[PDB]
Structure 1
Amino acid sequence: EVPDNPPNEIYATAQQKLQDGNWRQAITQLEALDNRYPFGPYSQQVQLDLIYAYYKNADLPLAQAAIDRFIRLNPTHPNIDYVMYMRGLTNMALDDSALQGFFGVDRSDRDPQHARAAFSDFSKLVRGYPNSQYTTDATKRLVFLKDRLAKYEYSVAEYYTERGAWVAVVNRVEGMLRDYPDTQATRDALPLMENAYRQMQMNAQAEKVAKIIAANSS
């Protein structure tokens, strides 16, 4: 429902229907340029406001679709850092972005199958682009998303402490254990695998994991 214009005009309709606020109009002329004019040298910049304005009506993964439209079609560009940062940001808000947790219960049990992939994106941003504007903020994400999977796994470690596969207690701890040496969740599940040891009468191996706890009291 949009006709053809001069190729420098549809930017403004992309720019200014972005300035409308009713979010069903912004993409409408954002997309209206690169269909009639994909041959402009600025069509990858149209993708940058596209991945931007895709978020607005809870219509997220076209951003990730337009994230990869930057990647494969266009070999040489420094703005992949934005594309890599918006990659995990698209990948994150599929997990926990609803307002149903408004009453005091958060959402780490809600499975981060794509915020699994958000960790993949933010790890490649901090290794692909060092001084880009998003490296620091993604590093903040890489701290919790590690732990966001951990308490998820610790819930299973609690669930395995609940149901009673005490071997599967320690592995849910061991899956949390061997990857990262930083979480406090690593400290507190460390007696539970050893409580699993204590219920499996591996009290010495419990104590050996309590020996791990012992110097970690800091």
Structure 2
Amino acid sequence: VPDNPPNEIYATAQQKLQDGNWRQAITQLEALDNRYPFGPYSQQVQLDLIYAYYKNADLPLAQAAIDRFIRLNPTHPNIDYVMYMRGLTNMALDDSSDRDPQHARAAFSDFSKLVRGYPNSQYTTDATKRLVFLKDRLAKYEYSVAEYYTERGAWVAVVNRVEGMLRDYPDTQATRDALPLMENAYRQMQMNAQAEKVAKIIAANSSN
């Protein structure tokens, strides 16, 4: 990297962000932030850098930067953006459905914090659209582990699992598709008193 004045380096990196070649926009932002790590225009270079890291799929570097931002500027005007952004980076790592949802509920947790705190965010209408996906996505996770244990013949495990789905994710598609597995588990342990109860629930509700 050169050592020109900061004014023209920010100009260089800005017109690398506008050309959508992030690999070089990063190497100049990184240099600008490492050299001027505080200052009045210091927050702007930190936002551009977490945007760049995200579009170049440098997601660990994006998270590490977003978390250091929120630690040092928890009251900054645009932490609705910074939060929306750590939701995307966590939802990128997810990549959906049968694999570790640690990244999905991380994403969910953050998008929830975005909408509770900033209901008039430009990112809130899209955010709510995202954690409607994420809900039935990690409902789908419970559905698959319920589905494994019904093949295994672990009926106690499958009803306890879908009981949990009714509790945590009731309004999801995954839990509608899950109930007939509960009904089965009951019937298999000759608890058909209880089966008849969940039988009434599927009989009284849409598949949609």
Give the TM-score normalised by structure 1.
0.87
Deviations 1:50-95 (A, max 9, x none): 1111123332121111112221112421211111111111001112
Deviation of the 1:146 alpha carbon? 1.2
> Does the residue aligned with 1:131 lie in a helix, a strand or coil?
coil
Mean Cα deviation higher: 173-182 or 10-19: 10-19
2:90/2:104 contact within 8 Å kept:
yes
Cα 1:57–1:76 change in 2 (3 A) is closer
2:143/2:175 contact within 8 Å kept:
no
Instruction: State the identity as a percent.
Output: 100
Give me the whole-angstrom Cα distance separating, in 1, the residues matched to 2:201 and 2:152.
25
Deviation of the 1:157 alpha carbon? 0.8
> Does the residue aligned with 2:55 lie in a helix, a strand or coil?
coil
Deviations 1:140-192 (A, max 9, x none): 11112111111111111110111011011012212211013311221221121
Cα 1:197–1:82 change in 2 (3 A) is same
Give me the whole-angstrom Cα distance separating, in 2, the residues matched to 1:78 and 1:216.
45
Give me the whole-angstrom Cα distance separating, in 1, the residues matched to 2:143 and 2:75.
42
2:17/2:25 contact within 8 Å kept:
yes
Deviation of the 1:111 alpha carbon? 2.4
Mean Cα deviation higher: 141-150 or 12-21: 12-21
Taking only aligned residues, the RMSD between alpha carbons, in angstroms, comes to: 1.8
Give me the whole-angstrom Cα distance separating, in 1, the residues matched to 2:122 and 2:178.
36
Aligned twin of 2:79: 80
Cα 1:189–1:114 change in 2 (3 A) is same
Deviation of the 1:18 alpha carbon? 2.3
**Contiguous gaps of at least 5 residues in structure 1:** 98-107
**Contiguous gaps of at least 5 residues in structure 2:** none
Deviations 1:97-143 (A, max 9, x none): 7xxxxxxxxxx123222122001110100112111111111111111
- Count how many residue pairs are aligned between Structure 1 and Structure 2: 207
Give me the whole-angstrom Cα distance separating, in 1, the residues matched to 2:90 and 2:177.
29
Give me the whole-angstrom Cα distance separating, in 2, the residues matched to 1:76 and 1:193.
47
Deviation of the 1:20 alpha carbon? 4.4
1:82/1:134 contact within 8 Å kept:
yes
